[PDB]
């Protein structure tokens, strides 16, 4: 997260860290959202490479024991059937991970709230992006969870020529673009929490930013619109 601030230790309990094994150590690669005690929602591009993945819940500082973390392996990966690695702009950047075991819920580990199917947010809706991703374009990962206020930019505006143009679809949500705050590498797959009816709900899964850099004016961070995949999500969890 570029231009963010350190999040309170228990502000976003559904946030998870998706890590892969590198030799004899683990490395953070993406964010995600705990949606069931044994299911995690993340971006499909986070699991394109065939590596060994593990999920960490109740995490705050990546480099030190907080005494609240739970480490669980990934048993099965279900990527959306239409996902195409060579065309992230085509959408469908979403995947579900079945955990090897159910995690225990407490003040640091809670399920994320999903929006009702089809819900579209008005322009400039209040949302926050969270993650341990780069704090600057071509920078380094954050040690502690960061958050940044990223109001939404409706489809009409986001798909205009001055912004993303035809690169963005209605199955996506745009947020930010002020040239100061944005998601960045390492935030992928993470949540976009938006306040609706007094409750924070996860409306997006971080998908992509500009090739020119993370925080670029008129190039808001793009997220997979969760509300467009509710039926798919429910079908997978109830089936597997
Ligand atoms: Ca830790």
From Swiss-Prot:
Protein name, as recorded: Chymotrypsin-like elastase family member 1
Species this protein is from: Sus scrofa
PROSITE patterns: TRYPSIN_DOM, TRYPSIN_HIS, TRYPSIN_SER
Gene Ontology MF terms in the entry: metal ion binding; serine-type endopeptidase activity
PANTHER family (UniProt xref): CHYMOTRYPSIN-LIKE ELASTASE FAMILY MEMBER, CHYMOTRYPSIN-LIKE ELASTASE FAMILY MEMBER 1
Binding site for Ca(2+): 59, 61, 64, 69
Disulfide bonds: 30-46, 127-194, 158-174, 184-214
Tissues with expression: Pancreas. Basal layers of the epidermis, hair follicle and sebaceous gland epithelia (at protein level).
Enzyme Commission number(s) from the entry: 3.4.21.36
